Design a protein around this ligand. Structure first.
Ligand SMILES: *[C@@H]1O[C@H](CO)[C@@H](O[C@@H]2O[C@H](CO)[C@@H](O)[C@H](O)[C@H]2NC(C)=O)[C@H](O)[C@H]1NC(C)=O
Length: 317
């Protein structure tokens, strides 16, 4: 892992702070915060209003989130600036207490990029609860890239990308704080996820890696959104948030929690919104920025992806 100083942010802290909020509180004075990091094509409320905002509130936290603009489609490295700044602010605002981070899709890649390249935060994050995290990117983005219709972060979330290379070469595929990864083989957005093994995009070494089919059997189906929103996902998430080890515990869930429907506690309307979650995010993707090349790596990450190709050409030391 990188050690040393946090890199400077490319955005002003005023801009970063404007991307962060807490439900019914300022980040500078907040009790039991949990930072939520949203998925590609969404803001915090869009990823989470149907699920972990009311679920995490009902578990006794104050939900905070970031909404890097536009809709998590811009440079993943910039999205991570929002996250790192948030952890610094919320640690201070909760009395210098460590806080959990809970994520969906890109949000987990963001958290892990943060922990990897901004060391100051490793001591401020309690645990990471990642749903369908794409630490290795996804193979599904490749063809879009080839047509130059991919957003900046979609390029970066491509299997083989300069960004995913850099993460793994800096040690980022090993958990850095106690981490639980809940994911599914039957994910239509993030693949590969089928091995129940280190090959899977959601796997971190020494993490609590929970492929839902490994617990629920090979005919259990939750998709990319259901990975976040299901009753089985809630049980695992709850376990991870409550656990004195910082990871979910096999003792806390079993066969009888293998309900693929949205989390029981959610309102009828939240359940309808949860089941429809992928539709607005795909629409935001389609409407957002698009380019013909992967955004450059920021100087701090270039030594870790020598030889990959970005907008300015081939990455050098
Ligand atoms: C998405 O990212 C692009 C590229 O970084 C941003 O476009 C730049 O924005 C800065 C700061 O506002 C401008 O000074 C540059 O001239 C822009 N460069 C471009 C278009 O190549 C864009 O602002 C970002 N989008 C959002 C919504 O924040």
């Amino acid at each position: 892992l990188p050690s040393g100083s946090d890199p400077a942010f490319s955005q002003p802290k005023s801009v970063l702070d404007a991307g962060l909020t807490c439900q019914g509180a300022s980040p500078s004075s907040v009790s039991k915060p949990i930072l939520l990091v949203p998925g590609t094509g969404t803001t915090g409320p869009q990823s989470f209003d149907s699920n972990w905002i009311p679920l995490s509130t009902q578990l006794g936290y104050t939900p905070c989130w970031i909404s890097p603009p536009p809709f998590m489609l811009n440079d993943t490295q910039v999205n991570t600036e929002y996250m790192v700044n948030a952890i610094t602010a919320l640690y201070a605002g909760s009395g210098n207490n460590k806080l959990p981070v809970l994520t969906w899709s890109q949000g987990g890649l963001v958290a892990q990029w943060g922990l990897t390249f901004f060391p100051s935060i490793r001591s401020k994050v309690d645990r990471l609860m990642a749903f369908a995290p794409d630490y290795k990117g996804t193979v599904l983005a490749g063809p879009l890239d080839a047509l130059a219709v991919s957003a900046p972060s979609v390029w970066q979330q491509t299997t083989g990308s300069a960004l995913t290379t850099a993460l793994r070469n800096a040690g980022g595929l090993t958990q850095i704080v106690p981490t639980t990864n809940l994911y599914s083989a039957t994910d239509e957005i993030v693949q590969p996820q089928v091995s129940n093994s280190p090959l899977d995009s959601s796997y971190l070494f020494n993490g609590k890696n929970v492929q839902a089919q490994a617990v629920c059997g090979p005919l259990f189906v939750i998709d990319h959104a259901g990975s976040l929103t299901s009753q089985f996902s809630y049980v695992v998430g709850r376990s991870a948030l409550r656990s004195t080890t910082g990871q979910a515990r096999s003792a806390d869930y079993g066969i009888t929690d293998c309900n693929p429907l949205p989390a029981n506690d959610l309102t009828p309307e939240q359940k309808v919104a949860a089941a429809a979650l992928l539709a607005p995010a795909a629409a935001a993707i389609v409407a957002g920025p698009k380019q013909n090349c992967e955004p450059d790596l920021m100087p701090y990450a270039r030594p870790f992806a020598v030889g990959k190709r970005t907008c300015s050409g081939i990455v050098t030391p």
